[PDB]
Amino acid sequence: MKAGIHPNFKKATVKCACGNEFETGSVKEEVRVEICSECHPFYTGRQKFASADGRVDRFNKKY
Amino acid sequence: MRVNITLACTECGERNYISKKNKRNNPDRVEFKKYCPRDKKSTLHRET
Amino acid sequence: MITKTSKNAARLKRHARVRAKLSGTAERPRLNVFRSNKHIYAQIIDDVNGVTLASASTLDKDLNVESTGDTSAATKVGELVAKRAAEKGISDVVFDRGGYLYHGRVKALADAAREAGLKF
Amino acid sequence: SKKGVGSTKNGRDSEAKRLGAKRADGQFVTGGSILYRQRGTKIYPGENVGRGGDDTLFAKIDGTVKFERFGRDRKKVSVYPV
Amino acid sequence: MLLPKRVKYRREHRGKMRGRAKGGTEVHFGEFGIQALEASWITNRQIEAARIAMTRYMKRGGKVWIKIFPSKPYTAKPLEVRMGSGKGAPEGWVAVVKPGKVLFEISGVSEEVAREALRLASHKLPIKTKFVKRE
Amino acid sequence: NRLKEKYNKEIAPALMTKFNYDSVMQVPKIEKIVINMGVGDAVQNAKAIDSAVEELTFIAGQKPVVTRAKKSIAGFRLREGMPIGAKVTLRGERMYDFLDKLISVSLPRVRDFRGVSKKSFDGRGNYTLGIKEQLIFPEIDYDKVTKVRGMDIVIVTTANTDEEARELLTQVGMPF
RNA sequence: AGUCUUGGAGGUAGAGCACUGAUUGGACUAGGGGCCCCUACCGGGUUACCGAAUUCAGUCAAACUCCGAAUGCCAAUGACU
RNA sequence: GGGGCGGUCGCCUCCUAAAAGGUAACGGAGGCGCCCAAAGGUUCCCUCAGAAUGGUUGGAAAUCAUUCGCAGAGUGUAAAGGCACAAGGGAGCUUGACUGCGAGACCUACAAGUCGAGCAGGGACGAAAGUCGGGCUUAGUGAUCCGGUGGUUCCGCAUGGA
RNA sequence: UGGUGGCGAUAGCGAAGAGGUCACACCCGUUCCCAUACCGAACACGGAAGUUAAGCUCUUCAGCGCCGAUGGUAGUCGGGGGUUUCCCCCUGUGAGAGUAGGACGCCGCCAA
RNA sequence: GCCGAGGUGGUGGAAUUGGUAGACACGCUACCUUGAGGUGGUAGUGCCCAAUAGGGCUUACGGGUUCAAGUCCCGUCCUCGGUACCA
């Protein structure tokens, strides 16, 4: 590694708003995250909100 | 433009050498160390 | 895919660049160096006759070393090179760094032969 | 009738430069004498033959001249002593 | 008007007409062909007239198979001009026809129509020519 | 640190017994990750190269090369030189850290994220992430962002065929 | 000096397409048209209307050579004349 | 291919050119009257053009990997010869783009023109072997006379200077 | 086996196999020498956790590549004849293409 | 026939000094002023696909140099000007 060229690297304690913590090494010493992988709904299988929401209109006869 | 260049010595002041250079790519006075047979050694030369 | 050619293929190309400009003539044998991961090897070759005259490896059960890849292993195999080159009298030799740098174990070989008395 | 047409546009040509073998195979040849005038290396220098700045092949020592071959499709001048 | 689309050198030498043809001496694309018994230059216009006579006698040609192409150009100085002062400007295109060279061919049509079609082709050509079957 | 241990421990026996290799060395490994930038606005905006010479030093601390055009192009108003695009190559520990940033931290922040494509394999075993917005993992700092200019990531395995690189990158954590 | 023997350099006559240019036809073929259907030039539905590049088979070249003569040339070696 | 008119006049490359060299025409094609202080030297590195795919803005084509590419690129510049052990690409350090030469050759009517191992004096790069007397070879140029400039244990119309 | 050399790819390419305690390697890390326009990919410094998958060897094979005759022919030196943009005969020479075939290694040195 | 010049929007015509337009003055178009035309005033203006955005054809044409060509180079057609002389 060239000296005086690269920025530093400390042990990043990546957080998440769902409380899940994770560890990398970055420029930032500590990182707070609002949406991680396990918080994002695509990673969590068939998600709650958009997949429960995305039923197309059943020819809305109902009334 | 391309100019005929003499390269005079500094320890002796004697001319002893010619090569060419640009007046635009080398606008400043150019210098080399060459051989001065009066001085019998490698010596710093100078455009005159 | 990503595929790589060996260390040895580029090593032989960069050795063949070296071999175009210096050779193992009469009364200047070629001092060749091979630099394996687990040992190191050094021959003293006539390239006119096709004959290696003296040889030394860290693959020698006499005068062994522990590390075999250390600079001290290269220094000991270099002093064996120069000692066999004095015992069988070539007395003047040409250093073929063989497709490597002149940096580490190879430079340790060369400095050991220059100290012990091979005139490169 | 005498109708005037001119203008060839293709007159000029360069001076003939005398390339090629100046000495032969089995020829006795002294040192420094030019063996082959060429451009590029149609034929390579071998033993005791040098390539010049204008890529001429010259003999470095006295001796006979041999035109052997460099293997695949490639030639070579080499000078030997007696 | 058979014309090469591009040519390296617009002014070439006239060459020499000696030896037989290198190849194409035998009919293999068609069934019936026409060989040259002599050597000549055949221009654009002779291949035009020959091929038109071929098409007009066959009245619906299976294939006509022109085997020679006018690659070589011939230049000509203008009328009533003295010798010298440069080579003349190019005027035409020529297929060099060595003896024993199959010029045109015929497939899918019976032998008598092929005889008379290549005969009407032959009377447009400057060469002595012969009919040739496939062997 | 964690993605190497996850890869070795969980993946290499599982992938080795999924593709039934006749040796441990046949198991594909992600060798390198090449991050292209490809900023060609250097012509009309001469400073712009420093954007992502600044940013890609922050994306991964290995400084990218200010890479040059190898051929003059008149249709792009560009002579040979006048450097275009930055380039990071990556192998070691920071790279598994970088896939840890991509998989676990960044790729949620793609603001329209769905299944990123199955059809981004070349036919040899290599993958590219095509990024259009330069702020995905939280270091990028909207404050220091005006031009949204995205990125090309070239995830390069050692896989010889293609669907075993598929089954590698699914197990590393890339969703599809 | 001649001739026999031997070794060479050089790429023409010939021949061949392996480069470079030219070029005949078959097979497919992304694509360009024309009949159009609706239709955000969007999706298409066809055609012996043309086809770049691939492949097979044939041609041509003073400034084309994967090849290559006969001669002439340069030599050495003895041999005679 | 009468003369005028037109065109040309020197140098380099190819074809003519007939397998050494040579070889004409107002024969066929082109270039030159420079450029480069790195586009020279040396040391260590290393491989091109295009294409198929995966790819934002990115388009047929900038930048990226990825295979296939002992050569379709490159070689400052015409053309030929040559080159992937580089002569083609990078980086470090450099000034041999030196001085006195030069055995011997090529070439040629002469004038000239070209090559040159090696020697000495001083170096450059390299650990060394070694390589370096410009660039990849061949164009990029002109005699003498007369002047200008710089330097010299040279002469200087009686002698010392001039 | 590993290094190193000469021989025209008859050496090659390509395809399918077999081998690891040594040996060459793939590999494991960068703490120092060094390095990477970026980076332990490379180059170096070390080490020996497993790996015969790749390089490497060692078998096969005639698909591309390569070597390659004999005969015949084209051409041509010399002599000659003809209706002479050319052709023919005689003496000697003699291709190129195509083939029959050869070939997927011969040969030195050193250390194990 | 030979030599020199020039071929540009519907028009006459500049760009001819190296970096991409198709200037400028006319027509043309939309609007304005007038009862209405003309003059006059404002805004556009090669073309075709596109609401704008935006990409390409384009400097007589066909082909090269170039990363680029209206310019650098050659050929075809045309229009200009000069020459076509000596018996």
Curated annotation (Swiss-Prot), chain A:
An annotated GO cellular component: ribonucleoprotein complex
Pfam families tied to this protein: Ribosomal_L31
Gene induction: Only accumulates during exponential growth.
Alphabetized InterPro entries for the sequence: Ribosomal_bL28/bL31-like_sf, Ribosomal_bL31, Ribosomal_bL31_A, Ribosomal_bL31_sf
Keywords (A to Z) from UniProt: Metal-binding, Ribonucleoprotein, Ribosomal protein, RNA-binding, rRNA-binding, Zinc
Stored PROSITE patterns: RIBOSOMAL_L31
Cofactor: how and how many bound: Binds 1 zinc ion per subunit. This zinc stabilizes the protein.
Needed cofactors: Zn(2+)
A biological process term (GO) from this entry: translation
NCBIfam families: L31, PRK00019.1, PRK00528.1
Function text: Binds the 23S rRNA.
Protein name: Large ribosomal subunit protein bL31
Organism: Bacillus subtilis (strain 168)
Lineage: Bacteria, Bacillati, Bacillota, Bacilli, Bacillales
UniProtKB/Swiss-Prot annotation, chain B:
GO biological process: translation
PROSITE patterns for this protein: RIBOSOMAL_L33
Highest rank taxon of the organism: Bacteria
Biased composition (Basic and acidic residues): 25-48
Subunit and partners: Part of the 50S ribosomal subunit. Interacts with VmlR.
Recorded GO CC terms: cytoplasm; ribonucleoprotein complex; ribosome
GO molecular function (one): structural constituent of ribosome
Family: Belongs to the bacterial ribosomal protein bL33 family.
Sorted UniProt keywords: Ribonucleoprotein, Ribosomal protein
InterPro entries: Ribosomal_bL33, Ribosomal_bL33_CS, Ribosomal_bL33_sf, Ribosomal_zn-bd
Keyword field contains RNA-binding: no
Organism lineage: Bacteria, Bacillati, Bacillota, Bacilli, Bacillales
Chain segments carrying region Disordered: 20-48
Protein known as: Large ribosomal subunit protein bL33A
Keyword Ribonucleoprotein: yes
Pfam families to which the protein is assigned, alphabetical: Ribosomal_L33 (PF00471)
Swiss-Prot record, chain E:
InterPro entries to which the protein is assigned, alphabetical: Ribosomal_uL16, Ribosomal_uL16_bact-type, Ribosomal_uL16_CS, Ribosomal_uL16_dom, Ribosomal_uL16_sf
Name of the protein: Large ribosomal subunit protein uL16
Subunit-structure text: Part of the 50S ribosomal subunit.
CC per GO annotation: cytosolic large ribosomal subunit
Family: Belongs to the universal ribosomal protein uL16 family.
GO BP term, example: translation
Annotated function: Binds 23S rRNA and is also seen to make contacts with the A and possibly P site tRNAs.
Organism: Bacillus subtilis (strain 168)
Curated annotation (Swiss-Prot), chain F:
Matching InterPro entries: Ribosomal_uL5 (IPR002132), Ribosomal_uL5_bac-type (IPR020930), Ribosomal_uL5_C (IPR031309), Ribosomal_uL5_CS (IPR020929), Ribosomal_uL5_dom_sf (IPR022803), Ribosomal_uL5_N (IPR031310)
One GO-annotated biological process of the protein: translation
GO cellular component, one term: cytosolic large ribosomal subunit
Keyword annotations: Ribonucleoprotein, Ribosomal protein, RNA-binding, rRNA-binding, tRNA-binding
Gene3D superfamilies in the cross-refs: 3.30.1440.10
Coiled coil feature spans: none
SUPFAM superfamilies per UniProt: RL5-like
GO molecular function: RNA binding; rRNA binding; structural constituent of ribosome; tRNA binding
Disulfide-bond pairs as recorded: none
Pfam families: Ribosomal_L5, Ribosomal_L5_C
Keyword Ribosomal protein: yes
Entry similarity comment: Belongs to the universal ribosomal protein uL5 family.
Binding partners and assembly: Part of the 50S ribosomal subunit. Part of the 5S rRNA/L5/L18/L25 subcomplex. Contacts the 5S rRNA and the P site tRNA. Forms a bridge to the 30S subunit in the 70S ribosome. Interacts with VmlR. In stalled ribosomes contacts MutS2.
Protein task: This is one of the proteins that bind and probably mediate the attachment of the 5S RNA into the large ribosomal subunit, where it forms part of the central protuberance. In the 70S ribosome it contacts protein S13 of the 30S subunit (bridge B1b), connecting the 2 subunits; this bridge is implicated in subunit movement. Contacts the P site tRNA; the 5S rRNA and some of its associated proteins might help stabilize positioning of ribosome-bound tRNAs.
Entry protein name: Large ribosomal subunit protein uL5
Source species: Bacillus subtilis (strain 168)
